[PDB]
Amino acid sequence: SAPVVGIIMGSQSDWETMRHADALLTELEIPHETLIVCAHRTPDRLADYARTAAERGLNVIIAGAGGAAHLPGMCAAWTRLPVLGVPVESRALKGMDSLLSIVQMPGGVPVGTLAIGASGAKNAALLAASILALYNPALAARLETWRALQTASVPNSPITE
Amino acid sequence: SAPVVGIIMGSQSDWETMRHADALLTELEIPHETLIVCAHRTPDRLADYARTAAERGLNVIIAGAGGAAHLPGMCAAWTRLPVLGVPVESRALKGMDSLLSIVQMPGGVPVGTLAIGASGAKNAALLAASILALYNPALAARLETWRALQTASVPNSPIT
Amino acid sequence: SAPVVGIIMGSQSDWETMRHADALLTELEIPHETLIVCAHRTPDRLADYARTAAERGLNVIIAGAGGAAHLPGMCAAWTRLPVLGVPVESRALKGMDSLLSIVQMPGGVPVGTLAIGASGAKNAALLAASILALYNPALAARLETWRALQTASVPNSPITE
Amino acid sequence: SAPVVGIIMGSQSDWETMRHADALLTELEIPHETLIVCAHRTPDRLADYARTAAERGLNVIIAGAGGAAHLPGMCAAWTRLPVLGVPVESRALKGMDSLLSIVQMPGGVPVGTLAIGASGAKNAALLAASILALYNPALAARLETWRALQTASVPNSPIT
Amino acid sequence: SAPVVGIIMGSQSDWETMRHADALLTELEIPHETLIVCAHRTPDRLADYARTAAERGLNVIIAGAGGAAHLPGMCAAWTRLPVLGVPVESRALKGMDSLLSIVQMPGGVPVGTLAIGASGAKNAALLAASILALYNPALAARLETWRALQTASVPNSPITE
Amino acid sequence: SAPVVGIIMGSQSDWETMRHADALLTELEIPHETLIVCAHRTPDRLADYARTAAERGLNVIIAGAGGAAHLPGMCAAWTRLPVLGVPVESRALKGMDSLLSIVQMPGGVPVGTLAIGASGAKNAALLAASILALYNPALAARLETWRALQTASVPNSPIT
Amino acid sequence: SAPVVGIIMGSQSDWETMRHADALLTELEIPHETLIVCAHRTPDRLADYARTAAERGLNVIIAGAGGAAHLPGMCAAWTRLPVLGVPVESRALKGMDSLLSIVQMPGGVPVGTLAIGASGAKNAALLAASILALYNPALAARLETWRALQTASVPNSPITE
Amino acid sequence: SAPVVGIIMGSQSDWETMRHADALLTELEIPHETLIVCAHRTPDRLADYARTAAERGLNVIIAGAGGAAHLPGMCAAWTRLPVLGVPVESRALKGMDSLLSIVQMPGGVPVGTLAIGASGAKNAALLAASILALYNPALAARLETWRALQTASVPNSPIT
Ligand SMILES: [Cl-]
Ligand SMILES: [Cl-]
Ligand SMILES: [Cl-]
Ligand SMILES: [Cl-]
């Protein structure tokens, strides 16, 4: 029941995107926590969250942010855990500022970055699941079933009417 | 000594970038294989490589490509393993084509994407290490040392 | 009656764009098939479709995809037929990710790329028609008539009221 | 020995790029002509070239241009033949201006667009070959060989 | 009464933008003609329009186009008159394809390019007026009055209520 | 011999670009002046230059600037003369900042914008010439000759 | 009561953005003036405003503009005061033209640039406040309280219902 | 001689850019400190530096970073002082990643951002000077002289 993934985001406005990560983890029966951590308004909260994540039993952090999106990178600065970053779509620049701010981490401090928006949030959860599946056989079986069903469920032709 | 990370790239020209991933894994003593697999020129080679990766004992795949960079995404299509993608810098568009081709995966098939170029290759290896460290205590300790040395080695002032 | 063009796309959401290719082929009386083939969820379906296209009698493949748009390029990897790619407009990046993912094929494996969106789909069908017209006199005459009528139908002045 | 593909470009400076199309067609023994035609400096030359291409026996036109790259689109305006466009890399904008000027054709007048630069020129020639192969069995066999050799020649591992 | 400026555009859809050029010329009492000329569907119409513009008494051409916007550049290829180009906003790429397709004319064949959209159309007309004013004293006086009034009409403070 | 075109630029570094405008005007025997005027470092110099241009007998101003390129727009703010703007290629952003800063003028104050770099400088001079040709028959004839020679001099095939 | 910050913008349309700077200054009890100054239509008004700002007692200028956004840079050309620039979002290019036109000032004439849009306007006011706080103890205390409250007010978790 | 401006940067490689800020402050005789602080490799060093800056007597912080450039924003998160950000030019994306990562701060935590590269570093120092000049009359006079000399030194015509 203890969380093994932490989903963090800077604002309530990010939840519309990050809820897709939350939903997927629940679907795959991966215990997790969901929190707001703002890199710019609560930097000490971030430092403490990231520093202590491993000792609290977290294995993966999924962090979403938009604009000058510093939350994933600063999380990775303080934790040795894998950090996955979700660029949240921004109003003016459509998430391009979010994307570049997250993915372009200089060498030495990684953030595994997913697509802009809801797709990225879903895939961050799936990527987290595939990491956890490496050392959890029951989850690995659930993930295999999930991927197989996704493949089997693709229609053969469009509805052209 | 059986590999647990696979590093794959589309061509010899990608090696100038992907060698940084190889060097990092060797530094952390993570057994790995380093191969050329081209999504466009050797698609069947890719299918076989990705489909069999898990049964061969690989845990993570690091895939580098430039331009219309399809290697990481198509690898992820055939494996349940985590796939990490490195956008190789392209001549004209400086890896922006590489980056968008890799990171903008549809929901359902993830690629964890790193920075354009050598930084991304180094970070893909470190991210692979941080994944393996979750279930390998000796490696977790070496990764802790690596990160601690990185932090401690930053100078306090520039040399003028 | 056997199809000589295959129109393929990754999702039902692509049909709003790809239907314009379908309509134009029908207008020019070019027999064709329309299918969903998702490069990422059904990669073996794609491999089989592309590998066997020539022996099935297809002459041209029109492939549409958005985002990390890999369907046209991977189709071309497996077929010796000409493959035409239509970038489908994406939500955040307005099809720029689609366009670059399709057009920037490194040397050795071509995809002839058309404009982002509905215009591109229509033109992929017209380009396919112009290819087929090289060795089909009746179609060449229909295409000539079509192009001539397009030219003759352009108004001389705008409705300025 | 009558040409069936026309390769046209706006200037001598484009030749560094378009020579890759020329070389590929020669390798596949596809008879072709290689000419300079500038949409902006020689518009009447372009009109005549494009309007008469089909009656001269051309089957495909490959057109390369950079910057405000109008040559492929205007060629397509005057011919019913398939026109393939190669964006030549520009000095400032690295061929992004070339690419958008060529690929964003209005519905009704297509240009099949290839990658920026030398890769695009090579691929325009290969795409022209794949078109001609549909109704030339000997060429189809040579193209099959070309693609098979490309696939088989990819090394399995990088040289370190 | 004979036209001294020609306003040309490729489609009726361009009129929503180009009407602002038309309105400004009329305001400044500059006789002009407004026509549809599509570079891609009616290339011979374009060649004839541009070739004969000077002998027909035109002094300036204002050409608007979007997407792969070739109309202004090809007009300039055939006329020695100054050609002013208006990038029409495009759906996916917001006129960036229009802008680059028009402004990036290689050396030897100029197009004086204005802003994307309605502002650009208005300014093309104003630029045309400033060209004509160099050798028409009555128009020069009207343009001076117009510019002076524009300056005098700027409010001193925003309505902040 | 009184100047009828003014070429202005913000710094000596712009001269590598703007010299192409100067050369073209000299070739067409259009009397002109070539000056440094910086919108940011010498704003009063700019105000005076632009406000007095018409009374000094200038007909067209060609203004080149890079980066946050404000020189053409601010020139146009103070003169009723046509102002043509040349985006100078910038180091980092390759003149895209220059281009947008110049071309995106608000309705009411036009700048006729040319291509990034040397091509734009040459074309600003040619556009100035085409404006002057409307009311100078001898110049119109020289411009006709210039354009005819440009067209006739394009080779028919590349040199291999 | 005399103003120590000037907020200037080129048009009434900019007020929807710049009002956020106005509101924040008022919240922090910083006396200020708000004016329209258009760099292109009223360049002499701009020259006079900027030249005389220091002698009028202003300490900081906040200037907002969109498109070819020259107002902040030209203000800085004429004043020795710090000038802060707010890129106003533009219709076609989403404020990217605004941003590059403001931030890319060559060396020698600075404009401190904030984010595109309302966030940038709010932050220009906050940056102005942090400048004034260096030599106004009462304001420094109000700003400290404001920043502390911002930090304390961040929720711990999203509303996930 | 106690520093009133802090110049910080993530690495030695940033010094080629940030030295221009250092030189300008020295020219205006503004006491300052120049340090390496990396947001990603030394985050605790950053937290301590920023949190204590005001109590140490700093008035302005100038922070330079490239790529995913987080140093200025995170500095601003911990200090009430004005923070000025310099986007360092990155290899692939020419500082566009640097620029967007720095300038697009959320409302509530400002970074005053300057141009990409050396120009931005020089201007961050000048902007810091203009801030300090508000409450230091001798410095205000030196800054007036600096700006006056800049203006007066612009040549009237290019050297050909
Ligand atoms: Cl290092
Ligand atoms: Cl090769
Ligand atoms: Cl030449
Ligand atoms: Cl200097």
Distance spanning both ends of chain F, measured CA to CA: 45
| 8 A C-beta contact, residue F62 and residue F125 | yes
Q: What is the DSSP string of A91-156?
A: TTTTTHHHHHHHHTPPTTS--EE--SSHHHHHHHHHHHHHHHGGG-HHHHHHHHHHHHHHHHTS-S
Range of the domain at D26: 1-160
Q: Which of residues 133-152 of F touch H (CB under 8 A)?
A: none
| 8 A C-beta contact, residue B81 and residue B54 | yes
What is the maximum alpha-carbon separation in chain B? 54
Instruction: Give dist(CA G36, CA G21) in Å, integer.
Output: 14
> Is B75 near chain D, with CB under 8 Å?
no
Instruction: Give dist(CA E25, CA B85) in Å, integer.
Output: 56
Per-residue exposure over F135-145, b if at least 16 CB sit within 10 Å of its own CB, e if not: ebeebbebbee
Instruction: Give dist(CA C124, CA G157) in Å, integer.
Output: 49
Q: What 3-state DSSP class applies to B156? A: coil
| 8 A C-beta contact, residue H14 and residue B154 | no
Q: Give the closest residue to F75 by CA, choosing from F9, F16, F122, F4.
A: F9
- D141 Cβ contact list (under 8 Å, min separation 6): none
The residue whose two tokens read 């490509």 is B65
**What sign does the dihedral B110-B115-B117-B121 (CA atoms) show?**
negative
Burial class of B101 by CB neighbour count within 10 A (0 to 12, 13 to 18, 19+): buried
The neighbour count for residue B45, using CB atoms within 10 Å, is: 18
Q: Give the closest residue to G100 by CA, choosing from G125, G128, G73, G124.
A: G73
Q: What 3-state DSSP class applies to G1? A: coil
| 8 A C-beta contact, residue F112 and residue G74 | no
Starting at the edge strand found earlier in the chain, the sheet holding C83-88 runs: C32-36, C5-9, C60-66, C83-88, C112-113, D112-113, D83-88, D60-66, D5-9, D32-36
> Is A110 near chain B, with CB under 8 Å?
yes
User: How large is the angle between the packed helices H71-78 and H43-52, nearest 10 degrees?
Assistant: 50
Instruction: Find the ligand nearest to D10 CA.
Output: 3
The domain that holds A103 is classified in CATH as: 3.40.50.1970
| 8 A C-beta contact, residue C93 and residue C30 | no
**What sign does the dihedral A11-A14-A16-A18 (CA atoms) show?**
negative
Token pair in block for residue A19 = 């809820």
Q: What 3-state DSSP class applies to C62? A: strand
Instruction: Give dist(CA G82, CA G88) in Å, integer.
Output: 19
State in Å: Cα F143 to ligand 3 middle: 15
Burial class of C68 by CB neighbour count within 10 A (0 to 12, 13 to 18, 19+): buried
Residues of B in contact with C49 (CB under 8 A): none
Q: What 3-state DSSP class applies to B84? A: strand
Partners for B (CB, 8 Å, 3+ pairs)? Answer: A, C, D, H
What residues pair up with D87 in beta bridges, in sequence order? D65
Instruction: Give dist(CA D4, CA D82) in Å, integer.
Output: 12
Please name the amino acid found at residue G104: Q
Please name the amino acid found at residue B59: N
Instruction: Give dist(CA B19, CA D160) in Å, integer.
Output: 8
Instruction: Find the ligand nearest to F23 CA.
Output: 3
- Distance from the F78 Cα atom to the nearest Cα atom in chain D, whole angstroms: 31
CB contact under 8 A, G106 and H115: yes
Please name the amino acid found at residue D86: V
Q: Give the closest residue to A73 by CA, choosing from H88, B127, B136.
A: B127
**Contact call for F and G: 3+ CB–CB distances under 8 Å:** yes
CB contact under 8 A, E105 and F115: yes
**CA-to-CA dists, residue D146 to C78, C109, C122, D84, angstroms:** 14, 11, 31, 20
CB contact under 8 A, B45 and D154: yes
Task: Quote the radius of gyration of chain F (alpha carbons, Å).
Answer: 16
Token pair in block for residue H85 = 């950000």
Please name the amino acid found at residue G143: L
CB contact under 8 A, B39 and C104: no
The neighbour count for residue F159, using CB atoms within 10 Å, is: 7
- Identify the closest residue of chain F to H98 by CA–CA distance: F92
The DSSP output letter for D53 is T
> Is H100 near chain B, with CB under 8 Å?
no
Instruction: Give dist(CA G6, CA G3) in Å, integer.
Output: 7
- C137 Cβ contact list (under 8 Å, min separation 6): none
What residues pair up with B6 in beta bridges, in sequence order? B33, B61
The neighbour count for residue C25, using CB atoms within 10 Å, is: 25
> Is G89 near chain F, with CB under 8 Å?
no
- Identify the closest residue of chain C to E93 by CA–CA distance: C94
The neighbour count for residue A16, using CB atoms within 10 Å, is: 14
Q: Give the closest residue to F7 by CA, choosing from F59, F78, F80, F67.
A: F59
CB contact under 8 A, C104 and B90: yes
Partners for A (CB, 8 Å, 3+ pairs)? Answer: B, C, G, H
CB contact under 8 A, A105 and H77: no
Instruction: Give dist(CA B58, CA B81) in Å, integer.
Output: 8
Q: Give the closest residue to C63 by CA, choosing from C51, C74, C71, C52.
A: C71
- Distance from the C126 Cα atom to the nearest Cα atom in chain D, whole angstroms: 7
What is the maximum alpha-carbon separation in chain G? 57
Q: What 3-state DSSP class applies to F69? A: coil
Instruction: Find the ligand nearest to F10 CA.
Output: 4
**CA-to-CA dists, residue G149 to D11, D70, D128, angstroms:** 65, 58, 67
The neighbour count for residue B137, using CB atoms within 10 Å, is: 9
Q: Give the closest residue to F76 by CA, choosing from G83, G12, E151.
A: E151
Question: Which helix or strand (DSSP H or E) is residue D7 part of?
Answer: strand D5-9
Q: Give the closest residue to E66 by CA, choosing from A12, G159, C117, G52.
A: C117
Starting at the edge strand found earlier in the chain, the sheet holding G5-9 runs: G32-36, G5-9, G60-66, G83-88, G112-113, H112-113, H83-88, H60-66, H5-9, H32-36
- Identify the closest residue of chain G to E96 by CA–CA distance: G93
- Distance from the H86 Cα atom to the nearest Cα atom in chain A, whole angstroms: 14
The neighbour count for residue E119, using CB atoms within 10 Å, is: 25
Q: Cα F88 from chain centroid?
A: 11
Instruction: Give dist(CA H63, CA H84) in Å, integer.
Output: 6
- Distance from the F160 Cα atom to the nearest Cα atom in chain H, whole angstroms: 33
Total of domains in chain E? 1
> Is C87 near chain B, with CB under 8 Å?
no
Instruction: Give dist(CA G93, CA F101) in Å, integer.
Output: 12
**Contact call for C and F: 3+ CB–CB distances under 8 Å:** no
| 8 A C-beta contact, residue D22 and residue D7 | yes
Instruction: Give dist(CA B92, CA D117) in Å, integer.
Output: 8
Which of F19, F42, F93 lies nearest to residue H94, judging by beta carbons? F93
The DSSP output letter for A81 is S
Please name the amino acid found at residue G110: P
| 8 A C-beta contact, residue A92 and residue G116 | yes
Instruction: Give dist(CA C43, CA B73) in Å, integer.
Output: 11
Task: Quote the radius of gyration of chain H (alpha carbons, Å).
Answer: 16
Looking at chain H, the number of H-run helices and the number of E-run strands are 6, 5
Which of B70, B100, B103 lies nearest to residue C73, judging by beta carbons? B70
Q: What 3-state DSSP class applies to E66? A: strand
Instruction: Give dist(CA F126, CA C130) in Å, integer.
Output: 40
- Distance from the G108 Cα atom to the nearest Cα atom in chain H, whole angstroms: 6
- A128 Cβ contact list (under 8 Å, min separation 6): A5, A21, A25, A30, A60, A62, A84
Q: What is the DSSP string of F80-120?
A: SS-EEEEEEPPTTTTTHHHHHHHH-PPTTS--EE--SSHHH
Q: Give the closest residue to D104 by CA, choosing from H31, E132, E88.
A: E88
Which of B19, B38, B92 lies nearest to residue D154, judging by beta carbons? B38
Q: Give the closest residue to E61 by CA, choosing from E79, E87, E40, E77.
A: E79
Instruction: Give dist(CA B75, CA B80) in Å, integer.
Output: 10
Per-residue exposure over H108-117, b if at least 16 CB sit within 10 Å of its own CB, e if not: bbbbbbbbbb
Residues D70, G93, A89, B75, Cα dihedral to 10°: 20
Tell me how many degrees the CA angle E94-E99-E104 measures, rounded to the nearest 5: 155
CB contact under 8 A, H131 and G131: yes
**CA-to-CA dists, residue E121 to B146, E9, E10, E89, angstroms:** 60, 11, 14, 11
What residues pair up with E62 in beta bridges, in sequence order? E7, E84
CB contact under 8 A, C15 and A157: no
Query: Using H for helix, E for strand and C for coil, what is the string for H48-115?
Result: HHHHHCCCCCCCEEEEEEECCCCHHHHHHHHCCCCEEEEEECCCCCCCHHHHHHHHCCCCCCCCEECC
| 8 A C-beta contact, residue H5 and residue H60 | yes
- Identify the closest residue of chain B to D147 by CA–CA distance: B41
CB contact under 8 A, D36 and F115: no
CB contact under 8 A, F123 and E109: yes
Residues of E in contact with C154 (CB under 8 A): 36, 38, 41-42, 45
> Is G155 near chain A, with CB under 8 Å?
yes
Instruction: Give dist(CA D72, CA E102) in Å, integer.
Output: 15
Q: Determine if residue A155 is left, alpha or beta; phi over 0 gives left, psi from -120 to 50 gives alpha, anything else beta.
A: beta
State in Å: Cα F105 to ligand 4 middle: 28
CB contact under 8 A, F117 and D92: yes
Which of B42, B45, B93 lies nearest to residue D94, judging by beta carbons? B93
Q: Give the closest residue to B44 by CA, choosing from C54, C44, C53.
A: C44
Burial class of B122 by CB neighbour count within 10 A (0 to 12, 13 to 18, 19+): buried
- Identify the closest residue of chain F to H148 by CA–CA distance: F41
Residues of C in contact with A150 (CB under 8 A): 41
Q: Give the closest residue to F62 by CA, choosing from E93, C112, E110, A14.
A: E110
| 8 A C-beta contact, residue C84 and residue C71 | no
**CA-to-CA dists, residue C36 to C45, F26, H152, angstroms:** 10, 63, 69
Instruction: Give dist(CA E19, CA E58) in Å, integer.
Output: 19
Residues in chain E: 161
Q: What share of chain A is helix, strand, coil (3-state, %, to 5)?
A: 45, 15, 35
Residues of H in contact with G134 (CB under 8 A): 59, 81-82, 131, 134-135
> Is G161 near chain A, with CB under 8 Å?
no
Distance spanning both ends of chain G, measured CA to CA: 48
The residue whose two tokens read 């008159």 is E81
Q: Give the closest residue to C54 by CA, choosing from C76, C39, C86.
A: C76
What residues pair up with C84 in beta bridges, in sequence order? C62, C112
Q: Determine if residue F88 is left, alpha or beta; phi over 0 gives left, psi from -120 to 50 gives alpha, anything else beta.
A: beta
| 8 A C-beta contact, residue H122 and residue H24 | yes
Q: What share of chain H is helix, strand, coil (3-state, %, to 5)?
A: 50, 15, 35
Task: Quote the radius of gyration of chain D (alpha carbons, Å).
Answer: 16
Instruction: Give dist(CA H9, CA G156) in Å, integer.
Output: 32
